[PDB]
Symmetry: D2
Subunit: 288 residues, 4 copies
Amino acid sequence: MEIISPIITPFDKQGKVNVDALKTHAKNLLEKGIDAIFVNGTTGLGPALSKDEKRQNLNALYDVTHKLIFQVGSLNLNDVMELVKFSNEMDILGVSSHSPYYFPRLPEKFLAKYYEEIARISSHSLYIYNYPAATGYDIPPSILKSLPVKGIKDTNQDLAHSLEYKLNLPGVKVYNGSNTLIYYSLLSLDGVVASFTNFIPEVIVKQRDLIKQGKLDDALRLQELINRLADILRKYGSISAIYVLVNEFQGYDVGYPRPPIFPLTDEEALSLKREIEPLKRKIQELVH
Amino acid sequence: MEIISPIITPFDKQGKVNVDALKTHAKNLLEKGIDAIFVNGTTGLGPALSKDEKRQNLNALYDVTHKLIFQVGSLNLNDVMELVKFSNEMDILGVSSHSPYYFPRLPEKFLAKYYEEIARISSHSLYIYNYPAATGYDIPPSILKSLPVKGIKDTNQDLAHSLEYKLNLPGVKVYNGSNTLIYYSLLSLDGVVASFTNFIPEVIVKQRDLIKQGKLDDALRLQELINRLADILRKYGSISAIYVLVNEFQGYDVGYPRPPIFPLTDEEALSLKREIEPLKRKIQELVH
Amino acid sequence: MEIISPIITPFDKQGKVNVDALKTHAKNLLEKGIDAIFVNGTTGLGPALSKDEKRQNLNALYDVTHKLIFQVGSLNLNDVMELVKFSNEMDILGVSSHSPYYFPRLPEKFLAKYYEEIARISSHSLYIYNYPAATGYDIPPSILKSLPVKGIKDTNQDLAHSLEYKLNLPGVKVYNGSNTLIYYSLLSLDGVVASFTNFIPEVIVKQRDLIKQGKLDDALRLQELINRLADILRKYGSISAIYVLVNEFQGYDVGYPRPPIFPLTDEEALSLKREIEPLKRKIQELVH
Amino acid sequence: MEIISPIITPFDKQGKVNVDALKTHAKNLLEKGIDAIFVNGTTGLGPALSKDEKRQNLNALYDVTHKLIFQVGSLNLNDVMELVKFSNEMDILGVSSHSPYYFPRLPEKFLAKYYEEIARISSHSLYIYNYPAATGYDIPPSILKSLPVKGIKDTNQDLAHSLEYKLNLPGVKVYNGSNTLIYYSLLSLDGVVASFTNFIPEVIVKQRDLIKQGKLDDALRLQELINRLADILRKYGSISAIYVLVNEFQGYDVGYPRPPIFPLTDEEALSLKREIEPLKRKIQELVH
Ligand SMILES: [Mg+2]
Ligand SMILES: [Mg+2]
C-alpha cells in the first residue's frame, strides 16, 4: 500500500518558489515514511504554476528522490508537450495530467485527444489525475482503455468510483486522493495521494502499518481524528492551512502559498492552532 | 441595449496568435454595429492565454478601437497585477476579471481579497466577469457592494440572477453572457456579451434595432433561430465551431482555436456546415 | 397571454381541506383577472393530497369555473388512472401530471410509459407539469413528441428550456412557472403559472395588461418588486407564507397549509408582514 | 456488523400487495442470516405505499419476526402519526422515517418539527432514514443532536458522511445503504441496509463472516462482483430488476413492482438474465 504525497510548493513572500524549502520538506517526508511524491498536483498549486515553475520543481526534487510523478497539465497543449519532452530525459516514476479545465461543455473527444497526444510522445508511464470537483470533468474508463495508463489518482469522495477503475482497467494502479477516505483506500486500492501527508505523514504511515498488522480499530480511530481536522481546515482554506501546519507539526518553515491562494494571516494562523490543539494532542498520543 | 462581443483569439496551426486576423475580425464586427469588444473572455480563450498573449491581444485591438474591456484573470495575482499596471497606461473602457478558478472550496474572503487587489491598483473602471459554470464560484453582491464596480458581465442561464445585480447595485451596468437569452437581456439589462456576435453580429444588432422599434415578435423569431443554432454547436464544441462559422457567415479566415480546445477536423467542419445550412438560409432571409 | 394560478388548498387546523375557502378564493382570483386555475399543483400541495382530496378539490372548483387544469400525479398509476377516468366525465380544460418522483435513477422509459398510460385513457387535453427541482427528472421534448400534448407548465429558471418546448413541439402551449421570470414569460411564451398569483393577482394581471400596451418599463419595475418579495418569502417557506399573504393582501382567510408544510407561527406571520411592508407599499402605489 | 434488509413489497399484476409472498421471502432472508428487516424503505416502495399498505406490510412481517424497523414517512404528518400510534402497540425494533420530500426549498426547521412530532408520540426507538438523492434534503447532526435518535440509515455514496454521524452522535448506530460500499461499511460502521440482500443475502452475509475471520481479500472479491452487478442493473431499473433476480437466485416468485416503478417485460427479464449469467456463476463458485 503506497503512500504518495502531493507535495506543496513553498513560495516566499514575493511569490517566488523556494526550492531549498521544497527539498528540505521532501527529505523529511521520505524519512517519515512517504513512498513517493506527486509533483505539481493541486496541493502543489499545479495549475497556478508556470511551465518553468513546474519544471524547476521536478529538477529540485530529483536531487532528493527519483520516485516522482510529474504533473504537467495546462490549458495549452504545446506547453504540456514541452514538459513531456523535458521529462523524457529524467529518470522518474511517471508523467501525469488532470483533464482540461475551466471551459464548460467541451466534447468528451477533446479529453481523449488531449491524453492521446501526451501518450504519443511520453517515454514514461502515464498516470491520470482525475479530480472532477476541480476540472468539471470525470474521465471514464472507456476513454482510458485505449491509453497506456499505468496509474490513476482519483480525488473523489465515492470509493466505488475508484474501485471501478481497478475493475475495468486490469493491471492499472489506483490511488484515492481524499484525506477523509484514507482508511478505506488502504483497505482496497493501491494506495493514497492525500494532501495531509504534508503535515501528518507519520499518522498516515501509522494507519498503513497498523492495517498491515491487522489492527483496524486503531487505524479507524486515527481516521476519525483526521476527519475532524479536515472539517476545521476547510474554514481557513485547506491548502493554505497546510503551510501553517507543516511548520507546527514538522518544525521547519515552508513559506506561504501564492494568491489567489491567500496565506493565512498571523491572526488566522493563531486561531487555527488553537482549534486543532485538542486533536493534535490526541494524535500525538496515539502516534509517537 | 449594448451589444458587446467577447472576441475570439485567432491562432495559426502552430498555436501562435494571428494578430492580423484579429484586427480584421474586430474591424468587421465594429462596422456591423458591435458596441464594445471584451478581450480575453472565455470565448477569446482567456485562461488558456499566457500573460504576454493577453497583453498582445489588447495591443493589437488597441490599433483598431478604444472600445475595449480587458480581461486579465489568472491563477497568479502577481501576473494579474502586471497586466493591470500595463493597462493603466492605455485609454480603454475598463478592466475585468473572472474569479479564481480550478481550486475547489476556497473561502469567500479569498475571492474578496483577489478583487480588492485589482481595485487597489487599477486606474480603470472595474468590470466583474461572473461565470459560475466555468470558475465554480458565484460572486455575491455582498463582496460587490464593497468594490468600485462599474459593470458586471454575468454568464448565467438564470436571468433573475442577472436582474438581481441591477436591483442591488445601483448604477452598475449589467450584461448577460448567454446566447440563448439575448432577446430577454435586451429587454431588461444594459446589454449582452454574447459569443455568437463573432459570426452573426448583424443578426444580434438587428434584434436590438427591432426591439428599439417595438418589433418584438420579429426579434423573438431571430432568437428562436439562434437557439436552434446553439443546440447544433454543442456537439462540436461551441467555441471551436465559432471559428468555422466566422468564415462561413463573414467571409474571412480567423484560423483555429488552440488544443485542448481542439479545432474541428475537415470532416467535422463539413458536417457542421450541412447541419446549419437551413438555419443560415432562414437567418439571411430575415437579416440582409 | 394567459395568467394561470396554481391555487392553494386551504386546510383547517386539523388538516382537513376547507372547500368553502377554496371556492371563495377562486372566485376572487377570477374577479381580479386570473384566466385559469391549475388544481393540485405544487402550490396546491398536490403530492401531499390523497386521491380523494384531489378529486374533491376539482369538484369544488367546478362550481366556480370550468377553466381548470386537473393535476393527478401520484406514485401509484392505478390511482392516477382512477382520477383520469373521473375527470373524463367533467367539462374541464385538461388533465395534467408531474413526472414520477422520489425514486432516483428510474430509466427514462419509465417516464414515457407513465405518460403514455395517462394518454391512452384520458379524453381531455394532456398538459405536462415539468418541475425538475421537485421530481428530480426533466421531461425532454423527445418523450413528448409521441404524446398528444396540448400544454406544458415548466417550472424552470432557464427560460431557454421553456422556449425549446415551443420550438420542438409545434402548436403546444407553453407556460413558465417561475415567479421571478413572469415579465419574460409574458414577452415570449403562452403565459405563466406562477404561485404569487394567489396573493398579488392584480400585480401580475397589471404586468400583462401593461405589456399589451407596450409599457415594458412599468412591467419590469413590478418584476423587480416581485423578485424582492420572493427573496423574503423563501426564508419562511414560500408556500406557507402565501397563506398568510392571501389574508393580508386579499382580505379573507384561507386557513393553513398542512405539515410537513408547516404553517407560519403567529410570531413568524408578524415578522413576515413587517418585512414586506415597504414592498407592499410600493406595489399598492403602482397597482391601484 | 449487522446486515439489514430493506425488503421488497411483492405486488400482483393488478398492483395489490401479495403478503403471502412477502412472508415467504422474509423467512428465507432470515434463515440465510439477515439480522433485521427494514419495512417500507425505498426498496419496499415506501413513498408509493398508502398508509394502509404500510400498515399491512408490518402486520404480515410481524407474523414472521420481531426484528422489524417500521418506516412510516409520508407527505401528511397526520397519516404518519396514525402509523406511529399503530406501531406503538407492537413489539418491534424501532420506527423510522425519511425526511419530507418533493417540495423544494423547505426551511430546515420544517425538517426538525417533522421529526420532533414523531419523537413526541412514538414509544419506540427512533431511526432516521437519510437519503438525500431521493428526498432532496440531507439531515444534519444539528437537528439530530436534539432528538432521541437510536440509529441512522444513511443511503449515501460518500462514506465519510456516514462515518461523521458516528463521531458526532455518541452511541447512535449507523448503517450505510449503498450496495457498492458494503465492504467498507462492514469495516467501519454498525452495518448495512443494502437492497441487494433481497436476492443475494448469502453473499453479503458471507462478506460479513469473512471479515469477522480477517479474510478481507475474499470479502473484497465479492464486493467487486456486487459492483459489476450494480452497473448492469441500472439500465433496467434497480428495484424492478431485484424482483426478477429474487426468483433467479432464490427460487421463489415475489411478483412485480407497481408502476410508475414498471416491471421488466418478458424480454427485458431475459436480457437481464443473460447479462448477469457469468457473474452469477462466479458468485455461486465463491459462495455455496
Ligand atoms: Mg499600437
Ligand atoms: Mg399477526
